[PDB]
């Protein structure tokens, strides 16, 4: 019962973007390709490597017509205190939802229970709602960027042109 | 819910290796590092590109010591002629083990329940049992194996250097 | 309790029929007698002796009006590979069903739990859908074709002819 | 579930046996070959030719060391009576067992809840206690004597050889 | 609890009756006085004395206005057989049915459920389907038919005047 | 699930015997052929009959070897004044039992759950404890104690001497 | 839960009331106050002390509009041959319940389990059916009809003009 | 399901006995003669008659070997209270127990539950805790002691001399 | 499980208010800002401050629109016994409701049930129904009627000026 | 059930403490008077008025050996950012617990379930671990830390000489 190739359930986060509050809901995300980004919390003295590559793909990620979504337990309110005090957040102009509730957490089966924080794991989103691509890593571990688009060009290739590639050679 | 960091759960299935058959338990990945790569199943015209990819790099991983488990819900016996057959599947050295129950395919949650196949997931296992990374994707959508191989790398680094940067 | 005179369930499963992959429904059999014969699995040691007998009848089977359907766990795409690739399993004209979800396979209450395959289990459905023969054997034991032959001529007898002493 | 392949449950039925009554249990069939041989119902218009057949062949079955068991809903008084009153049932040497609780026919699940009888079943028991052929049919369906027989010197040619192909 | 003074509850059961066979149910004895005559089982060597005395009266029943029924477990097969076979059984003119399923036993709870056989009880049931009188013997102690006759008459003479001395 | 060919069920109720009272249990009916005889109650106005022919027989029951008990939903009280009042019952010597809780009634499955009475169910055990023979019958229907003798002198032929009687002349 | 202060359940029971069987119901202690007499059993050794302070009280009780109902295991034919035999009970005026099947004795929660007998209780029921004074005792305990006679007059004085005070 | 005769169910609650408070379990119940007296509630206006009249009796009760137990949902504190601003409860010496928690009144299945008072209930349990006789009235209709000591001195008779004849 | 933001329960308790007894209900608490004033008993020992504190403050209470309702596990009757007998309880104009059932206290959550009594909680509620500030403290822990008047005014003002910033 | 007079849950949580972090369990509440200050979250633009009154009474608590916990929902590793930023919080002395997982928040019963959030509710625990006096308020409405430490006080008072009266 894996969450491959499954349809997002709705949720309702509060979000900062651009030096502002917004709301985001399942019917933000109709009709675009979306990408929510998991990661433990804010504060954390870990390097910000992870969201600092997905920061400068993001001007490529709009061009291709991907939303992006950085997804924590933490609130809307922490995510723009890090945005003005941190080196390498202020790069980010994509929404950074805050999830206290973890229900949004919990929809994509991502939380740490006896920590009370998020996995790390990036999930790809269709216009239609489908679920096309899971990465999940620990603690440490680097997830690549430009892997992630790859994916993204490589799920848009096959949804606008489904049956694709070799048969094999005897 | 959520795989990762999680010790994985026990199993026996057989498998084909190198023209012969062999029994695989979860014993055998104790004090190993260890890569399960599921695939929907054998002699299908989508053809193998992702597997064969991880067929190169084999000598890498194994001298870095790193064990390769293709796993699907199709029989050893299958697994056996599509070695034989295709010639991208010629190049495997590695393990090739078979769900007909699909009793390992559902440990790890990655079992298409209406379809009856396994998905397209690569999980990697360390010496103790615990998963430090997962990606799955969907069809058509391919998995990169030189990004694998960081992966690898990364997950051993943090594991003898713990606590660090 | 008995499986024996009773409606089959419905099912949806891919097939292999010389060349092409069609679905097969509960549906197709209506209006139709039918056979379906289980097997464990493909591309094993023992002798297809007991499939090419049948392959050898088909001819007289669909004189008489009667649909032949070879059921696995194993997928479609074994199937076709298995029929191309060696031996008498290419004389099947008939469809081999594959049935990786063992819905099918359940349904006739015929699977190996711990195996995840089927057991060796030869049906005679009739036109209203309701089983009429069944023979259930274990591995090594084979199955006479002549002598499915006799009792599908005798299902359709008795299914002519009510009051017979 | 599947009936093929498990052990056989205890019972405690009355018999007759060529003109004395006997008990039968399942500690009789313990090292030996045994053939339960189900049938609706005595006095009946059908001819009894499936019984003859086994009568026949009897004598060869008694050589490879095989007991034969044959069973109804029917009491064993009625039994004696059937055998002494007329035919070519009258050629039976081995037991007929009487089941007026059913007990025996449910442990086979194969009885017609509606009707209260048994249904045509034929099963292949051995040493062990476990079965190995199943073949249960219709109203008006033959049963081959000569198909069975084939059928049980193959189950003890695979027993004798665990490795064949 | 205490079969008496209820309604008897509804049967499809088949019988025989001087060289054919009928089927009977709960509505043919509507608006009749019945009496249900219960015996183990066909062809058992203990003789029928008590059975055969019910022969006897028949027509001082059949006079009076009274259906008789003889219940067994075995079926009306070898009802018919049992009553070509004896003498005394060749008597009978009245319907004999069996219970293969012993559902019209359980109406009564008259079933030896260890045994699968009926006990020796007859049962007197009037127009609108009460029940009047009850008699229920162990195996060997007989069922007197004179004390039987007198049964029905006392039970009619109550029917006919209700409420006095 | 007939009660034939049964164990009797233990009991602990009063009745009454000839001027004085007594507790008659399931112990008492040990090694001993027993006559339940189970009737409406007492000071109806439908003729006592049944127990004036049963009464009679008593004389030749205990030659046999065999007791006899009067059941009713009755108590043991108004037996003992049922006896000293009427005519018939004068002729008893047996013991009446008196089963006020219906628990002894209720044991042989013979209870007019709606009236609160008992059915007229005569029963035959045996010195085991074995029901060998049962007669049940409605109000107004008679019960002949010459018939419930031949029953009782074949149940003891039986007991002393089992596979009696005929075969079948073909 | 307790009993007091409850509509009693309706009932089907025979009776035996001066030379003559009669059925009472529910709908007979309707628009009129009643009083329910259990006790354990008839032609019991024990002396009917408390039947006949009922008995000779039976006339106050008619005259305030009160019926009385002897209730018992033991059938209405059994009651009628107790009433023949004693003197005590041959003055007895007022209805005598048969209860065989118990239900009676069960709607007020009053059964012997054991014994399979009523236990010896007294009853104060109002025209609307409500229960207003209970009084329960052990074999061998008396019970007062005099005493029984003042609750009834307290509960009609309260019945017709309640408060009032002190 | 009636509690005619059995043994009362053991409690813990506090009570308050003649210018102070104490508390009292069914321990004090071992031997002796215990009456538990049941009542809606304290400072009603209702007449406080019957427990005025116990407390005549009370000093006639103590020498037959006889406890009192005044029971109410209110608290021991109101208690003091309310036997201080009294009139007629003033003579009460014997207990006055508190049951808040409404755990001793519901032991003797007492309790209006739509009011979460106590019903007007009087109890009599001997010294092996058996319950002999039970009284319960409704609002107004009152119980006197006489009739009560009368119950008392029956139930020691018969306790004394089982087996009686007539 | 926590119910600081939520529509109290339905009740329907009767009470003592200033002389004479009246019944209230949730209905009563449609408008207004009912403020429930929850303690364990009447003529305890311990102090009766607090009630006497807002005793004095009641008058600028009901000037805001607001009331005061005095609960405990006790009756009314006690409560007009108690207000008689007082000395600064006397003071208390509000309303003082007697909650024998126990409902209207485990309504909010409020029992202490092995002592069958009220803790000493208060709660604040709006005109809506909803809960806004909540008070509960251990025997002897005072809870002053200042520190409540405060919380009612930032109570009010929040509710009539929603949103601020800062 | 009302949670006022419990033992405490244990618990272990990450807290903050002027620039170093340190692990806070039920051990550290051990044979000290305690206070969990629960709130909603961090960087709100509601001033925090409440925080800064217990900062400037932390002197007095301290005295009186009295230990103060900030809990919210928000991580450790926020408080500490927020404790740099702004003037109000970087007075604070005491301990910032962070309870991501909710478990310290749920043992109180104390948890926003819609919105993931802690509600403001302040607790007084004592060296036992029995909690004496709770505090909860709606959004918006401010709680007095003068007011708290006169609960303190008195809780110190009657847990050192109970009884006394007036």
């Known amino acids: 019962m894996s969450l491959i190739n499954t349809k997002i359930k709705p949720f309702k986060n509060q979000a900062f973007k651009n030096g502002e509050f917004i709301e985001i809901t399942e019917k933000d995300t109709e009709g675009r ?24 793909h993001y001007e490529e990620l709009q061009k291709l017509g991907v939303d992006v979504y950085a997804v924590s337990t933490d609130t809307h309110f922490t995510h ?17 939802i805050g999830d ?59 949804a606008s042109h489904p049956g694709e590639v070799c048969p094999a050679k005897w």
């Open 33 to 56: 390709w979306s990408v929510f980004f998991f990661y433990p919390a804010d504060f954390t003295f870990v390097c910000p490597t992870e969201l600092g590559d997905v920061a400068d």
């Open 80 to 96: 723009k205190a890090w945005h003005s005090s941190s080196e390498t957040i202020a790069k980010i102009k994509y929404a950074m």
């Open 100 to 158: 206290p509730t973890g229900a949004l957490t919990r929809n994509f089966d991502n939380m740490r229970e006896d920590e009370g924080l998020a996995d790390r794991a990036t999930f790809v989103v269709d216009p239609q709602g489908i679920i096309q691509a899971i990465e999940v890593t620990a603690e440490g571990i680097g997830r690549d960027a430009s892997d992630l688009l790859r994916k993204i060009k490589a799920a848009q290739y096959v």
